[model samples]
Target chain A: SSGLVIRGSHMRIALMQHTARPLDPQHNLDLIDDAAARASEQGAQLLLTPELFGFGYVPSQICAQVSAEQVDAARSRLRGIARDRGIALVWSLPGPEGPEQRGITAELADEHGEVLASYQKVQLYGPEEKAAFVPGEQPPPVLSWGGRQLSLLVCYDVEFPEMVRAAAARGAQLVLVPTALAGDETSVPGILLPARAVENGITLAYANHCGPEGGLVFDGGSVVVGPAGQPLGELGVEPGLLVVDLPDDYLQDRRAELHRNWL
Target chain B: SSGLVIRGSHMRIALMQHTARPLDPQHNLDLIDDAAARASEQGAQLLLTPELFGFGYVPSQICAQVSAEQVDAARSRLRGIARDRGIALVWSLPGPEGPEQRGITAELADEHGEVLASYQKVQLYGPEEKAAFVPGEQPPPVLSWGGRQLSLLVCYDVEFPEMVRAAAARGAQLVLVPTALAGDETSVPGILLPARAVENGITLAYANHCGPEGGLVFDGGSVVVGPAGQPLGELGVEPGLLVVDLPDDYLQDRRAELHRNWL
Candidate 1:
């Protein structure tokens, strides 16, 4: 028989993948509110939504029509939704300074509606992103939370292993990325995301938009990967919610591997 | 579609996954010779075998029973197999200096049975390997090969993204790995291998042992992934061969993505 008993250090996270109408914040915010409500009921402590979900993802639609005040208003509502639902939230929206300035942003809000951490997009995507926005000089922020460390990344930032490694080096146990990875790019979720988690020995929750948004068809492949590069929960090209429980002490076991020295 | 035509630069590579008896050189070398013969008939110019296939992977058996003379003789016959089959070969074997010294080695031979390149494993897996071997000092060699750059990594070496990144930085367009990834670690071939190829914009052929060998049951999931994180060919738990065509200049299109700058 066993002599020692270790308590469960399980941390449950919820990811939302849904469709939103172009340039419509009403339909978009409603989707997140619904997700938060359902996720909270399923014992989820935190909920993550897609990148730029509040204002939509198309470059022309967001850069030409959306304003800083609208983004601020959406953040206010998002914070309120998190508070009411009693769950922490990761919200991706436009740069508070606008598209002409420091590109996209990922904001973390606590259960009580307090802003916990914020990060700007470090790597911009396609011609549309380069023409519409500028990259941020700052990297993803690593913050202490719930006996573990938390970090944030936007869409294109998570695709780079260097970015995830930086967060891991800074003692981030969990990385939350709000991605609007559209088109036929299935490899980002199926391959790259899990690789990042396993290689760094950190938990990763990547939330992406499903169905058509703006001018592009979003590939809905939201996933939560464990520290050992295992997919704990995954969703395909359909609107759904994935609530996954991850161990907090995964890095401890991975540290014994010689590759940890390379980190 | 009507304006121009780009000539096909397709290069097909074959990956072999098969069972081998522990400490038996005759059966192990015979498998490679058969694979090379079949692969050449199917238009494969290069064939890759599992790691330490000539000597077997069980630490105790290799360290206690196998000798330097046996390893050298196996390599000599492997080179002959390549020349006779008229195809390039990637063969993994033990250190000529023995298990307590430089550990595992990967040898590359051309169609003329000439040694083209050699690299030692930088990362060793499990306690058995650490007790029986020491890590290599030299990194995976990046060499110029027919119309493309080629590189090599051993089993545990491919698990870490940094190794693949370094090879990619040195302009490696195709990376061939001989792996003995055994047991339930399906994520290694299914997730990490493709991520290495996609993230680095390189073609990767990963060959692993199938069925049982030594004291471990090999996963046998051999795979060839393209620059786009797509599988060219994949095998399950069964002993098999995967032959697939890869473009020599596939990295050209990937350079357009912003993630390439991060490299």
Candidate 2:
């Protein structure tokens, strides 16, 4: 219902924990494109895929053996799907940049398959990521998206407070985090995600891949959190897409008079 | 018990809140001494008496009326009590450090009644504390106490994460908060204190005054919490002396394996 004070009721975002094939990049692209089409039809303004979604998270030995042109072919196929669906697309690809990533970067396309902006992953995880990819120098900036400025970062990057605070400080209303966070008993990102939203006073939507794929397992606990570390909703560990609607102007109203800077 | 790896343990701390009649040094010292005895008997390793516990929370308005000799008299008396009972004591007093400090600067005295360190409250609440007291230039620092690097912050300091993190980054084992947090509120400390501990990966022991003092009512939720931020026992919100035994080696075990540093 349209009220005098409100322009729209809510904005819905769909997060896809896309499963990737280790040896096959073309098959993975097809699956992701199909998921994006389904999500667009399901009324998702944006579709987010997991890390290393396009091709496979090839280990050093396998990566060296794989040819560069095959990866480029996979990217071109997914780019076509984004154009066909006419919805925003985000994914991770092992581009022909270098061995240690050019970085885990995001590809944003408009409703007409037009490329908007490319965001490189800033904070890399451990030696694996450092050796596998190049890290971006700057943090995620607030980008215009879904009628809001969204601060986006890759997996492991959101574990640090500076990464989250950087987005929040930049007037990012929603910190969109697409992660492939797998195999950590301690729920640092799960627990700290809410802490980031609460402490930084922003809304956060985190998407993670679930189930075993390419000899790897993903912990599929996708969630949308409000300011002050409050959870709006959460998803179970299942191989599926999760969609949640968030109020556009909700954070402005939830702002407490007494706000403290985090340590 | 000695072999138990206590990563994080809950310890109780007392926040003694009382208003002293100006120039009545004997009355103020007695209040803290009596409370300390009871707290130590109850097994409290740390007891944080409220800000300016020695000379009462005398605002600057009465600065002309109270002389340095009178304040010194109060300190000497409190020292006697601390030396007699060798328990860790955290208390504050009015000092002549700030710009002609008409008001009291918060000070911490050890169990031996010797002043460990002092802090001028950065954000002095209310006109009474603000007017006479010159605000300090630096934020609070975590001091060494009984085998642990403890964070000693006066009222309003806990609200800042930088101050808390300053203690954490400096390897603070516990955050000893001495506050005059008052008024009608249930579980304010219960909710916020645990959040602080959980988020910052530090133990938080808050001491807040209960009963009617300074023409305001305090909800006694003073408590000690573990690294995960849950209260060590039940919430400590009472006027009487409360204590909890914190294992000395608890914090030494919680390495920054997944610590998220935010600049």
Candidate 3:
């Protein structure tokens, strides 16, 4: 694929949403492999995916389906996928915590297969999640990539306006969210994500699974919201892909006129 | 009409939206008077009105039309309106600032005509507003009414996520907003307001002027949103009144399960 010029200070970003076999970590990796190839082939430089896509979102049977060693092995394959496909990836997994302490984490790997940044899920979900995994202690990181500042946050963390505020306050222009939303929480993408995009003067790409994931009948409302608080790209219940090119200075232009007092 | 009990922790609230004659503050008060009478007759204990309705949103004219003394005199009459109508009022006014500061402020007048809480508009809008009046150096006041906690916010202030967070953190179950949103910023109610309600687990009732003001054409997307991220009541571009009964325990019930981790 021909590398497109960053005209008008914009970057093309992609997202993947689908239902994967619950206990097959390797099968999930295969899905990402195909998705990354497709995204890169379409000239997208980076792909944002749903939370725990690498490890398969199984809380009650945490280690039964995918163990710590399997986690490491899947990440190794992801590194190869990024390097081979020549596309950056923001992927999620239940990374080995403290190298036995389990934590849900997201890692950003560049097109060269080099890990650029990683963040733990600071805001865990329900009792099942809290009991199965420890919440991450730090905030999401904002890293420079493709001439833009990008940040990461897990599912429940994005529900809090402060998480997006923290990233935006740190100069993040785009927020990549990996979410494993249940069917009941469609408002996460429909209302909250767009509002977070507007108030922060940033863009947000939220990736969520489309179909059933163990106990969760995943809501397929994955969306790419612009600073104007409208979904530029969206998906229905069908598994599919979405790509959007975001303007870089839109955030600066908006903030130059008006912004929040950060109360 | 019999005043219904606050059964299951609920409070009946009312909001007013309309097009007012430019530079005619008295006419706006007449509209509010009739709305309060109707809402009170229908058992709504409190009524929320649009921003600057007391003095008319004439920033460029300033003291030429309505002076500081005029603001005080109008407010004095409003005290009588609330007392006579037997309804609490969350009304906006360009009250006498420094007792000629000409600041935009909102006052909470109890049914007894007592001024319990008043908050100056902390977040100023465009250059026109800033040049006309100084910004308020305070946050909205959260007070109890009808066996429920409520707070007050001006137009631009509620656009920030923290404004709602501040009130919710201060034990507010409902947030009342008096807005003069221009036609350009429909997202203020369409997206931002509802998200604030969900994230903070609090109800929000935003009252906006319909049709045109002096130099601005108002976007009449007045809305009342519940903590579950759904609009309990909404308005179109036409002038109208909205009434909704809010469950007080709903806030406690929503927060009882889970809430945001304020970063």
Candidate 4:
């Protein structure tokens, strides 16, 4: 009601967790469109989707088979979703920079359907990923959105403190991570993610896939953490959506004081 | 029945939390002797005491009034206690480096009463501390002790991740900290300390003072965290002792894996 509570200057973000059909870009787009509509109705300015949701996280085979036409169509549909919903979108997909070059890349599109920032995944995980994709050479990318500084990171990359510290150094207020975690037993969601947010004094939103796709059992422990390392909201192993508001001018004064005195 | 499980190749450490009489070195030395005896009886090879415990963290007048005879006597008593108990000790005291030089220095004494390492506090807290003590210019120091790599940080120094990371980068398996926290509201013990241990994959022992001493009310939440950020033991808001064992080969293979793959 009343134009999305514009009084305190708050920014709302939506995180989605759901299973992605393998090699089905159109079905994934439909899911994203539906999620975006719901998020917009709830007054979220930004919606973050799981890693490689468009073509699924088929790390081995999809990279070779994802054609240019499919990539263009998926991009157009994602932009249309953002424009139609009047909300920004952040999502990851495998892009072929060259016929021999392919890597996981995250892109942010504005409500006007303009691209804000794009970042490639720098740290590849395991021998399977290392053999499949070329690692990004550039550092984590940050851009201004909704009067806040936002950053992007793919799966496995947010686990490193050094990577998160680099983003904080670049003046990122919120870090958005898209992951496809394979196991429920991992401590990344509970321990490391909150640790990163609190230690760096930045808001963090992590979205991961749910259920099994082929042989992979995705752990859908999506979470959002405030600057004080406290969990704002979280989702379980079932498919769901989380919409939380980032505090207005959060940590700005306290962060300065921490640096000047405590830190 | 098993004498604190001395089967594996683990290192046992003791953390002490207590209020010290202001400007009374003799009484403080006696307390240390009693704690050391108890810690050794409990199978602890190393004992960690609170920051400036001998002079009672006197931030106002004692830093300037501490005499060389009193300092020398305190040192001799500390060394004797270590030798008599046959356990290494880490303690902080305001020392006279020269006729014109004075700083709060932390020294590590071996079981044989030999000094192993000494480090000055690199990051002082506020204007009161800044005016009282000279900050150490060198980085965090790591030393070898009892088949383990040990590091030393004093109070506010360990609050900074960069300081702890420097010690971890120097291959420290255990980082012992002597702290005199002023208030119970600080998040250093609960948040930053554990994060430092988990992020760097090192064990951390934080020893602090309990109860009230003069105008300052010390928060005695002393804790010992394992490499995986799990608390081995913790002391509440009262004077107490904590003894815990670091796991066998605690960081040998895991640290290598973290550096080679995770980090």
Candidate 5:
């Protein structure tokens, strides 16, 4: 029998947020499981978690204390959560790279608990981060996923236009960012993120930490911006989740036309 | 006895807007004269006018009909206006380069009536512009003036981020754009222009036409944006002048910090 079948090529992404406890891997892992289940229930294909939410941000002393077994244990739990919920996950974590060097790294995992892509933070924010972590040597990688190109950048890396432009220039359709921004740094999420999405002709989902963690108070203005530079959804200073369907080909179409004439 | 005096350097810019008559160079020249005088009275060093405000936009039919005498007469009046008011003036006009080619060129004239910098439109908007004028072959030039670096891009050229980025890369501190935007193009003033200022760490003065000119209805959301991507002053859908002081070393200072690590 000859029949017509119509399928919408829409991708739903959920940006997760909460107050993370310092040096508490088990507590953060439990939160991730709950959020992933909720995101999957809401029909979100991917769940984006905040920067270093598993181990907390600004964690040098705590990072020096975590063992390899503890790091592997946290990863195992996150992998199991992704596989059980059948939802993709993205998160930034701090871990040991060698006997001497430690750094922040962002990873994307599939529903089968397989790590698809990982990128270390390229641009460190301040002197404390510089003294604490080794910067990533390479640019962020764009991976092919579910008929779309996706990339990851951690926190301060996404604040620079050149970094995001480099990702977009590599044919990334969607760029995911995990951030732990301070309250005074609201301008990054307010002005820079939207502009980055618009200027590059790509969709950007910036997941950020909320409330206070240790000595820092996080500004949770996490936002999902479309290629047209408009906010699809936004979260306030409180802990919440933002789920929105990522538009397909709107950016690609606009990009082709902009090159042909005016943008 | 002479004492050393220390003062902060500042530059004032005025974004001029007005309704222009199609093909009436004399009438538009008078408008420029009035704007220049008023801007000088308001302590503005530079006055910016809309795209092709002198000869009117969408005057392709009349462009071919204008004689050399009429073009010279218009230029002479503009030069006199600049010299008499002792204010720098920037405007776009349609002129005959050779017998075969005619194009829209933007120029900045000093208080002494000397043409300091000139730039032709590189990115033409539509078929009408393509048929009427020859597109520019080179990027806009960044000129040093009044303790700041300045550049000019006319109309559609300012829409592309790459164009403005090129100017900023070449040390442009303030970008003056003369645009005759359609009523529906509120996004350019609302989003893209501010993004341009923030991304490049430069100031932008966007002058636009208001009201209707022939078949086109101009949107007068002309704005002066600081390096921080905040609007210093903005105009509504009416003819007005926006005067604001351009901050010195804001971009330079932020730029040094940005390049020190991240950007």
Candidate 6:
């Protein structure tokens, strides 16, 4: 058999999750900080972390008790570490923004500590986020990176078609979701991420938290989807960086078929 | 003394078509003559005629020979019958636009021979109609008749989700289709139509010509789908009329419970 020859460069992406020690933002950040360093050592250009990884997905009731200054202080440290490591890190932090503006999207710097681009959650799913976070009016701007247009989305937002379609329509070849999803609602996003890829002709990467945190459970069924609506199986078994070469013409071919009413 | 109490009126509207009779409109009309009379007597509020019912639906090769005057003559006679009977009728005739606009969508004349709103076939369906007829862009306009928001769309147009969704979005409670689709396509409207209505969350009445003509077997697997994607029955049966009483709130209730994501 001939050896396989893949064309494009691979970028490592991971789904990072661990049991939180509760109210210990520094410990959780440290846990992910070590994981990101390992992923970088494994040659990852981008490292994706779970939603609210900064201090665990503490219920809004618990969130109300935490100091905004403490959360901001933790966010500043994580951002600084990502910039120093020279790797594009995607991490989630509980925002000081009101419930209507709870989920804020921020990107790590290029070892310069400067902000790249930030997106807010457009859809506030159920009451937890609904009561604690404001919904985003629009999707984030697509970022050009490593020959692909990438967009960042938060947990629950992926359930809405408008958010996914908007990302695809705006030339997002790959969608990276940072989610702190509960275990019960797993099948929808797990199955639908692939369906969205098949329908919109794009690729999607979902990163989720696994294990119990603050008396809540995270399903941690993060997955990746190709244009054909099938899982690419890029990430599997355990929390670590997943990598695969990106495709350029696959989305175009799929869109052309859609235009011809092939669906 | 008694007070008049009126809940909304409910009625089953039946729509039928003669598939492939473009070369012999008179003969095609003759074949359905018994079926139409029987359907009307059974209280069918509306009966639909296929595209170019007079032309017998010959492909591009024979469509050119169909003159406007001959089609207009047939329309005049059909109009006369409608005025005399006081029953609802939907039929097709050759349009005055040109050879490219050979198919004309017509409705019941209000006893004055004046044409009501008519929608031409937007998509001419492969080479047969497309070869001689210009495709229609917009769907047939909605008509307020029999206390129902009745919409008229041609055969091939019914397959598109957008067209059906557009009708549903326009407040169309019931959609009537006039089609001469041959059963040879195997799936034809059997598999497609129900899905269209189900996905769009609306009801539809589809009629197709039965019997063999012009080398194509007219599979009269005509069917009706109630709101919520309930298939009335199998699609391959004969010219019998189907009556279904639909509650307006059925779709709204199911959507709220099942498809809460749908707007």
Which ranges of candidate 2 are over 4 A from the true structure? A1-8, A56-75, A94-96, A184-186, A213-217, A249-263, B1-31, B50-81, B92-95, B98-106, B121-135, B180-200, B210-219, B234-241, B248-263
Q: What is the lDDT of candidate 5?
A: 0.78
For each candidate in the order shown, give its overall lDDT on alpha carbons: 0.80, 0.63, 0.79, 0.80, 0.78, 0.60
Winner on DockQ between 2 and 6 is 2
| Candidate 6, true inter-chain contacts retained | 0.00
lDDT of 2 by residue, A62-173 (tens): 3465555765676677677778986777766654675544566766666666667667777666666666666676657678777888777777666555566566666787
Q: What are the TM values for chain B, all candidates? A: 0.89, 0.77, 0.89, 0.90, 0.89, 0.79
After superposing candidate 1 on the true structure, give the runs of residues whose Cα lies further than 4 Å from its correct spot: A1-12, A21-43, A60-70, A227-263, B1-10, B41-43, B60-70, B96-99, B228-230, B236-242, B245-263
Per-residue lDDT tens digits for candidate 1, residues A1-263, read 11122257456778989987778888889989999999888877889998988878877667878888887899899999989999999988887886577478899998998999988887778778877877776656799876689999888777777678667867888999999888788778778888898778888988998887777898988988888777778898999988876655222322223332232
CAPRI band for model 2: incorrect
TM-score of 6: 0.58
Could you give candidate 4's per-residue lDDT for residues A134-198 as a string of tens digits?
77766677888789899998888777665776687779889999898986745677667776787
Per-residue lDDT, model 2, residue B4, is 29
Candidate 1 vs candidate 5: the lDDT winner is: 1
- lDDT, candidate 4, equals 0.80
Model 4 steric clash pairs: none
DockQ for each candidate? 0.23, 0.20, 0.37, 0.26, 0.26, 0.06
The sequence of per-residue lDDT tens digits that candidate 5 reaches over residues A72-165 is 7787788788999899999877654641486788889999889898888878777677777777766678989977899998887776665776
Q: Candidate 6's residue-wise lDDT over A1-263, tens digit each?
A: 10132555355454455555567888888887887777666666677777777767775753465566776788788787787766777776766664334554545444455557677766656666556665555555687876678887787666544466567767887887888776565444544465456545777877777666767776766667777666665433345445544444223322222222311
TM-score preference between candidates 1 and 2, better one: 1
**Alpha-carbon DockQ of candidate 3:** 0.37
- Weakest lDDT window of 10 consecutive positions for candidate 2 chain A: A253-262
**B1-263 per-residue lDDT for model 1 (tens digits):** 01122247457788999988888889889989999999888877889999989878777678777878888899899999999999999999887896467588888899889989998887778778877776776657789876789999988878777677667767888899999988788778777888888888888889999887787899988988888887778888998888876654222322223332222
Evaluate candidate 1 and give its CAPRI docking class based on DockQ: acceptable
lDDT leader = 1
Clashes of each: 0, 12, 1, 0, 0, 21
Model 5 regions lying over 4 Å from their true place: A1-9, A62-73, A94-96, A99-103, A137-139, A247-263, B1-10, B59-73, B94-96, B99-103, B134-139, B246-263
Regions of candidate 6 where Cα sits further than 4 Å from its true position: A1-5, A8-12, A15-24, A94-103, A106-114, A183-187, A190-195, A210-219, A234-242, A248-263, B1-263
